[PDB]
Amino acid sequence: RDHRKIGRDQELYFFHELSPGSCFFLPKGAYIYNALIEFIRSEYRKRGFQEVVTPNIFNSRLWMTSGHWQHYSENMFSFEVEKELFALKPMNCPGHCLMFDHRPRSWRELPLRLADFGVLHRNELSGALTGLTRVRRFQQDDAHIFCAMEQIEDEIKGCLDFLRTVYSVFGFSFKLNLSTRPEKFLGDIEVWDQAEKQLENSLNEFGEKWELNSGDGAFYGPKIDIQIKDAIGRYHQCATIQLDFQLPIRFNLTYVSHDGDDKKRPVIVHRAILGSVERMIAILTENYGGKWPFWLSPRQVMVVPVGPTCDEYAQKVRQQFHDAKFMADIDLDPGCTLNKKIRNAQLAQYNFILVVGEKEKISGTVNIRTRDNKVHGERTISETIERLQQLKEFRSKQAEEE
Amino acid sequence: RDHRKIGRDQELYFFHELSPGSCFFLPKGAYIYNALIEFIRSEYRKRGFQEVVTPNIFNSRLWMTSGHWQHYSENMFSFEVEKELFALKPMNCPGHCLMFDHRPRSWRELPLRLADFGVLHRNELSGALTGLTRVRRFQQDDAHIFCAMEQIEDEIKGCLDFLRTVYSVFGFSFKLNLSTRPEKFLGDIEVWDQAEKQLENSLNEFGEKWELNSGDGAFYGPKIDIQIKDAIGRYHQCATIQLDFQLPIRFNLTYVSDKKRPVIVHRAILGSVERMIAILTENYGGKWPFWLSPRQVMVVPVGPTCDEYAQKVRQQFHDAKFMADIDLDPGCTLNKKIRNAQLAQYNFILVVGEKEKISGTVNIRTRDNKVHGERTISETIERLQQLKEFRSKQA
Ligand SMILES: C[C@@H](O)[C@H](N)C(=O)NS(=O)(=O)c1cccc(-c2ccc3n[nH]cc3c2)c1
Ligand SMILES: C[C@@H](O)[C@H](N)C(=O)NS(=O)(=O)c1cccc(-c2ccc3n[nH]cc3c2)c1
């Protein structure tokens, strides 16, 4: 259905006229935002990606150097500072190039994979802006791979595999596209043809069917564009793999090669899997219809006292799950039946409802019910925490509590 | 001794003329950056603080409503978009007011504490910019507490406790100042007096010597300001607890008790992650405590026959999950690799020879060159987890 509506109703996020094309993520929405980042970071840690932090604001001269100013000026927020033109970054690459270039580099560091969740700004038109789908502010799960010519093949394979494992945690399939030199391109047509050839070859050595997106490459290189299929039937433009021979020439990037070859230029692969956190929250909100899987759920645990004499104990249980990092709420409202409250928490999409009466208070236990109304019965607080930690850590689908 | 130099030498961060007043954090500096945010996060979870994500650019009308356009205009970066005026946020507070105002509020959800690590920008003069001390872009460990009048006393107590517990982890003492209304403020003098009286009171309920600091308050409220004293004995301004009666009026904020005004407490403890990073880089002279060090373990084989075993050991510490490196370089002696790792500031060097490979152990040398003997991998892992989890200093 509609992410804007669900995000509003579930108290995840909202939009305000004083900041069009940006989003206000309420506590429950920020939890989803951060869990998506943690998910990506945890993959980075097994794949040799290293997170960095960069500026948001740069002198126009940087954008001139990178050719962003020439090709991409329509889309940037510029202002002046002590009589010099500055602009909010729309992409992280040029910053990353300064980082590669900061000190001399050795072949031994390659591939160098720099990741960045920094906030980007693109000046889309007022009337084109919509929800989390077309925006002015976003954070990508961005990274730039700086590598040698001989590493290109393996790194592209690496990107496709990473992308497959990521979307398989959501349960998503995907389709592949090859995007060709646009008009408004940078550098040499013959260099671009090498770049297109290599992407083509990488596409054919990977399993899958692919189509041509004629003329849709970035100004700096051709790309593999990946559309994801959600559980409903919709395709979304999320991921890219972009082969860039042009920026290294622009920034005069070099590394020291095997001794004694001369210095060479690094190759740059731009990539993003989620695309932007914002776009991906949109997609997921609609995909699950608010029925979040446990690790993504900002409603993990509802604690329900049987009656008001078990209130304080319910508060204790709720605090314990809270302190163990779960999104845990409590329903003390005396006006409704136990069964009504269980049903409400279930309609509000809580994964686990923990019922607490006298007998549970006395023994430090909980009576477990799931979202889909499965009864698992009595377990201690600690064992419940332990088992729920596994389900979260492994990012599964929680009809598996046994 | 200077964070800029240490940062350069340790490959933590550097600065560039193309973005004066903003920092480039290399992977090892970015590690430190995030470990600090993580530390604060884990305290938030224990103390009923709820993190949010907000926009960075807002239509100028919001800054007019908040009182920022009249009082902070010059300190802000502004630009036009479709014939309208926008500006990058210098503070999170107005966005939080919008969030609080998004739907009617019940006294039962108060105190409501909104935490935000968003990027702030303020326009400092170029000639006053220095490393991580005076900057244009920064992330504060900011939060705004929305509470009832009769709740102020406990919350400010809580803010004091939060403060002590954090600074105690670093090992810092601190002193307290009261910042009085400045010139060019908003609201009634009378209400201000009322806000100053509550800060005065709580300031000596918390039985600690405190100083007056005339006219240094924010335009929206009086401040408890806090300087910390580091290990070298230098004082730094970091933490602030600000009592705000004005923004609730300005934003027409009410809650259902009938319909009263919330009180806002602005608060930060680290100040900015940037500033605290400068302070910590200098405080230690580059010698990171284990929980903050991005160079926690260096694995060193004794010769090439132990390369594969050293690899396997490093991978186990990496997986466990430490910042674990390895030095396979065949043209440096064992003693040179150890010396190098120690000068690079690794907390522990794990020496791995033929004995160690056979036994599934490690031989450990500390940063300051003390032997800790042969140890099993899993006991060394447990130890280092303790050091990390409890954020241990030099004991
Ligand atoms: C990935 C970054 O490092 C790169 N510097 C960039 O900003 N690229 S991008 O803005 O053009 C970008 C980012 C994310 C997704 C896409 C994109 C664009 C079009 C697509 N069709 N199918 C999948 C698609 C993906 C493009
Ligand atoms: C908490 C937010 O709502 C507030 N808008 C803010 O940004 N505060 S602030 O910019 O004034 C600020 C932030 C961090 C530190 C200080 C500060 C300022 C002066 C000080 N003297 N001694 C300790 C001090 C601390 C001020």
CA distance linking residue A147 with residue B357, whole number of Å: 33
The catalytically annotated residue of A4, A68, A121, A144 is A144
CATH architecture of structural domain B286-395: 3-Layer(aba) Sandwich (3.40)
CB B374 within 8 A of CB B363: yes
Contacts of A325 (CB under 8 A, 6+ apart): B45
Method: X-ray
Q: What's the CA-to-centroid distance between A275 and ligand 1, angstroms? A: 7
Closest ligand 1 atom to residue A271 Cα is 1
Contacts 24+ apart (CB under 8 A), A385-390: A385/A320, A385/A321, A385/A324, A385/A326, A388/A294, A388/A300, A388/A301, A388/A321, A388/A326, A388/A352, A389/A324
CA distance linking residue A46 with residue B46, whole number of Å: 30
Q: Which ligand is nearest to the CA of B219?
A: 2
Name the β-bridge partners of A267.
Answer: A147
Place of tokens 């990092």: A325
The residue whose CB lies within 8 Å of the most ligand 1 atoms, and thus the one to mutate among A236, A240, A243, is A240
Separation in Å, CA of A326 to nearest CA in chain B: 10
CB B367 within 8 A of CB B345: yes
Residue A270 annotated among the catalytic residues of the structure = yes
Angle between helices A27-47 and A152-170 (to 10 degrees): 140
Name the β-bridge partners of B268.
Answer: B142, B240
**CB-CB under 8 Å, A137 with B57:** yes
Report chain B residues whose CB lies below 8 A from the CB of A50: 27, 30
**Distances in whole angstroms, Cα of residue B111 to Cα of each of B47, B48, B116, B249, B252:** 11, 9, 16, 18, 18
Give which of A370, A290, A356 is closest to A7, Cα–Cα.
Answer: A290
**DSSP per residue over A175-201, as a string?**
EEEEE---SS--S-HHHHHHHHHHHHH
Q: Which residue among B27, B58, B123 sits closest to A19, beta carbon to beta carbon?
A: B58
CA distance linking residue B313 with residue B353, whole number of Å: 12
**Distances in whole angstroms, Cα of residue A395 to Cα of each of A107, A142, A322, B243:** 37, 22, 19, 42
- Amino acid found at A48: G
Domain boundary assignment for chain A = 1-289, 290-402
CATH architecture of structural domain A290-402: 3-Layer(aba) Sandwich (3.40)
Q: Tell me the structure's resolution in angstroms, rounded to a single decimal.
A: 2.3
Q: Give, in degrees to the nearest 5, the angle at Cα A144 between B55 and B18.
A: 65
DSSP state, A12? Answer: S
CA distance linking residue B215 with residue B177, whole number of Å: 12
Q: Which CATH number fits domain A1-289: 3.30.70.1290, 3.40.50.2300, 3.30.930.10, 3.60.10.10?
A: 3.30.930.10
Percent helix, strand and coil across chain B, each to the nearest 5: 40, 25, 35
Structure tokens at A194: 């090498």
Separation in Å, CA of A186 to nearest CA in chain B: 22
Superfamily per CATH, domain B1-285: Bira Bifunctional Protein; Domain 2 (3.30.930.10)
Whether the upstream peptide bond of residue B111 has omega within 30° of 0, thus cis, is: yes
**Distances in whole angstroms, Cα of residue B313 to Cα of each of A365, B239, B293, B380, B386:** 41, 42, 19, 11, 19
Structure tokens at B101: 């105002």
Contacts of A42 (CB under 8 A, 6+ apart): none
**CB-CB under 8 Å, B99 with A126:** no
**CB-CB under 8 Å, A121 with B57:** yes
CB B141 within 8 A of CB B151: no
CA distance linking residue B136 with residue B122, whole number of Å: 5
For A123, name the nearest residue in chain B, comparing CA atoms only.
B81
CA distance linking residue A393 with residue A373, whole number of Å: 23
The catalytically annotated residue of B68, B96, B144, B337 is B144
The catalytically annotated residue of A93, A159, A238, A310 is A93
CB B29 within 8 A of CB B277: yes
Q: What's the CA-to-centroid distance between A121 and ligand 2, angstroms? A: 27
3-class secondary structure for B89-129? CCCCHHHHHHHHHCCCCEHHHCCEEEEECCEEECCCCHHHC
CA distance linking residue A331 with residue A246, whole number of Å: 58
